[PDB]
Design an enzyme around this catalytic site. Structure first.
Site, short mmCIF file in Angstrom:
data_model
loop_
_atom_site.label_atom_id
_atom_site.label_comp_id
_atom_site.label_asym_id
_atom_site.label_seq_id
_atom_site.Cartn_x
_atom_site.Cartn_y
_atom_site.Cartn_z
N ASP A 54 8.51 -22.41 17.06
CA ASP A 54 8.17 -21.44 16.04
C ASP A 54 7.92 -22.12 14.70
OD1 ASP A 54 8.19 -19.70 13.91
OD2 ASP A 54 9.17 -18.10 15.06
N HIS B 38 1.65 -11.41 20.93
CA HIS B 38 2.41 -11.39 19.67
C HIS B 38 1.70 -11.89 18.40
CE1 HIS B 38 5.88 -11.56 16.91
NE2 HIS B 38 5.87 -12.88 16.95
#
Ligand code: HEM
Ligand SMILES: *[C@@H]1O[C@H](CO)[C@@H](O[C@@H]2O[C@H](CO)[C@@H](O[C@@H]3O[C@H](CO)[C@@H](O)[C@H](O)[C@@H]3O)[C@H](O)[C@H]2NC(C)=O)[C@H](O)[C@H]1NC(C)=O
Ligand SMILES: *[C@@H]1O[C@H](CO)[C@@H](O)[C@H](O)[C@H]1NC(C)=O
Ligand SMILES: *[C@@H]1O[C@H](CO)[C@@H](O)[C@H](O)[C@H]1NC(C)=O
Length: 448
Positions: A168, A304
């Site tokens: 991330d 996402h």
């Protein structure tokens, strides 16, 4: 024209704490007078700035930031209008428009009893622990701890990855011209993130100019269950079971776990791509000649990161960099929490220990950042618009449907109309909206 005073901005907002461990320490203010006295004497001069935090040689042993709720500001006698009604009403009130019940919330989040949060970061928990002591000794009973969340970077080669396994923190807006932009990165005015900065249309109190709205969310992740779902629903194919399962995982996220965006590598992970900041964001969703409105063979519309930064889906340039929807950018400062998956959870495919992401977003208007992304984009089965089929479904990661399974289309490359019904693998335990004031405010108006 004139640019950001980084000596006066709290570091988490623009650069992040830069530490292995963080503590979120949620408090109530018991006596305002005393509290202000130490706020000014003991907090203000140790609050870490962007300038501080982006100098290797100038990192504190313990990094501290501080942010206040609406009820916190009120308690300090600060009745000014910050110009954000989502901030004023509080996150508990906002819960319904998220299609989530507060039944699973941290009881302390399900009200307005929390007056603020102190964020402590350090490379070990011992240092955090002692700093808490020292703060609690100083402040005495002018403050109560109401709740706490410990967090850290994940262990080993998993560092920088979140609990599902995915690298991330690749993607953040570039502030013009604070940041020099990378290939494919969006570029926005400072006032998208910093309240009162360049092109923030909203009137602020003058003391608040240089702060940000911190949207906090304690998001439990059901990792064993997620992994089992991937194995159970992996598309057919000549690939190994494990490859096909990983493929479905990546198609849900929009990136492989290495961080390589599937838009550029739709059929297999490419870790060298994933590791390269010069390449790993350099894409818009457009490809010659596939048409934008129907082609899901590179990346589902429901993925996402596509759902939260639509890029060429919302128009603009087809070649990078796409600069669509600049006003809907959030800076992300989140960090995982809880233990690694244990042997017994893996075996039973069932979670028993709470783990996930302590999700932090910064933005100047709550209505354009976290809240917008979550409800208008993630939770909206017709988003992005003008696709065929029209029903994109929900974000497989954060999409909510009242604790019912989310219907998400596009995931399976052989048939874009095929639906999966997907249990929630991420479970909100609530949080709250804070205002992270410029440091000058902290020993200035807030303590004064
Ligand atoms: C436990 C829940 C969450 C997980 C596991 C998660 C995971 C990730 C991952 C793996 C990425 C790719 C890394 C990157 O592109 O930098 C990402 C990107 C992103 N996510 Fe999340 N996320 C979560 C919650 C949220 C929430 C609640 C929102 C906001 C409503 C959000 C908004 C973003 C945005 C804006 C990006 C960058 C997309 C881009 O710039 O292209 N995420 N997330
Ligand atoms: C970011 O991605 C873009 C594509 O969206 C890359 O631009 C493209 O890069 C290729 C090079 O692999 C360009 O073709 C090549 O470069 C020279 C340029 O003079 C060209 O003459 C040759 O044909 C060669 O193959 C391609 O034209 C270009 N496309 C566009 C639309 O600009 C860019 O390189 C990427 N950035 C990074 C850092 O990788
Ligand atoms: C967990 O899921 C896997 C894959 O579907 C399956 O092989 C295994 O038997 C399940 N474990 C248990 C304890 O049911
Ligand atoms: C694709 O999925 C849709 C919706 O389930 C289904 O009606 C259609 O038969 C599918 N096509 C193929 C080739 O599976």
């Amino acid at each position: 024209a004139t640019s950001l005073n980084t000596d006066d901005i709290q570091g988490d907002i623009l650069v992040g704490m830069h530490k292995q461990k963080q503590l979120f320490y949620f408090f109530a203010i018991n006596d305002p007078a005393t509290f202000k006295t130490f706020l000014a004497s003991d907090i203000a001069p140790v609050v870490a700035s962007v300038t501080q935090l982006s100098n290797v040689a100038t990192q504190p042993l313990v990094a501290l930031n501080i942010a206040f709720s609406n009820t916190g500001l009120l308690a300090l006698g600060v009745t000014d209008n910050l110009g954000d009604s989502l901030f004023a009403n509080g996150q508990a009130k906002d819960a319904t428009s998220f299609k989530e019940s507060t039944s699973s919330w941290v009881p302390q989040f399900a009200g307005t009893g929390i007056h603020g949060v102190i964020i402590l970061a350090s490379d070990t928990t011992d240092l955090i622990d002692q700093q808490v002591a020292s703060i609690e000794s100083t402040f005495g009973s002018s403050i109560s701890k109401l709740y706490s969340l410990s967090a850290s970077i994940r262990p080993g080669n998993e560092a920088g990855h979140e609990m599902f396994g995915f690298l991330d923190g690749i993607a953040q807006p570039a502030i013009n011209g604070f940041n020099t932009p990378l290939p494919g990165q969006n570029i926005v005015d400072a006032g998208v993130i910093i309240t009162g900065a360049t092109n923030d249309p909203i009137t602020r109190p003058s003391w608040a100019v240089g702060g940000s709205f911190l949207a906090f969310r304690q998001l439990e992740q059901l990792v064993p269950e997620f992994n089992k779902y991937l194995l159970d629903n992996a598309p057919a194919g000549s690939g190994s079971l494990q490859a096909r399962a990983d493929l479905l995982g990546a198609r849900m996220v929009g990136r492989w776990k290495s961080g390589a965006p599937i838009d550029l590598t739709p059929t297999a992970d490419d870790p060298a791509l994933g590791a390269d900041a010069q390449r790993n964001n350099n894409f818009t969703y457009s490809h010659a000649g596939f048409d934008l409105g129907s082609d899901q063979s590179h990346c589902p519309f429901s993925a996402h990161i596509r759902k939260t930064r639509p890029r060429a889906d919302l128009g603009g340039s087809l070649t990078p960099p796409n600069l669509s929807a600049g006003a809907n950018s959030i800076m992300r400062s989140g960090i995982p929490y809880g233990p690694e998956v244990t042997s017994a959870e893996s075996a039973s495919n069932t979670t028993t220990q709470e783990r996930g992401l302590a999700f932090v977003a910064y933005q100047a208007q709550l209505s354009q950042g976290f809240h917008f992304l979550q409800q208008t984009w993630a939770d909206n089965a017709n988003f992005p618009p003008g696709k065929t089929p029209a029903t994109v479904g929900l974000d497989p990661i954060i999409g909510q449907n009242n604790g019912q399974p989310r219907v998400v289309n596009g995931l399976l490359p052989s048939n874009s109309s095929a639906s999966l019904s997907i249990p929630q693998f991420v479970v909100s335990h609530g949080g709250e909206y804070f205002f992270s004031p410029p440091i000058s405010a902290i020993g200035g108006r807030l303590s004064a």
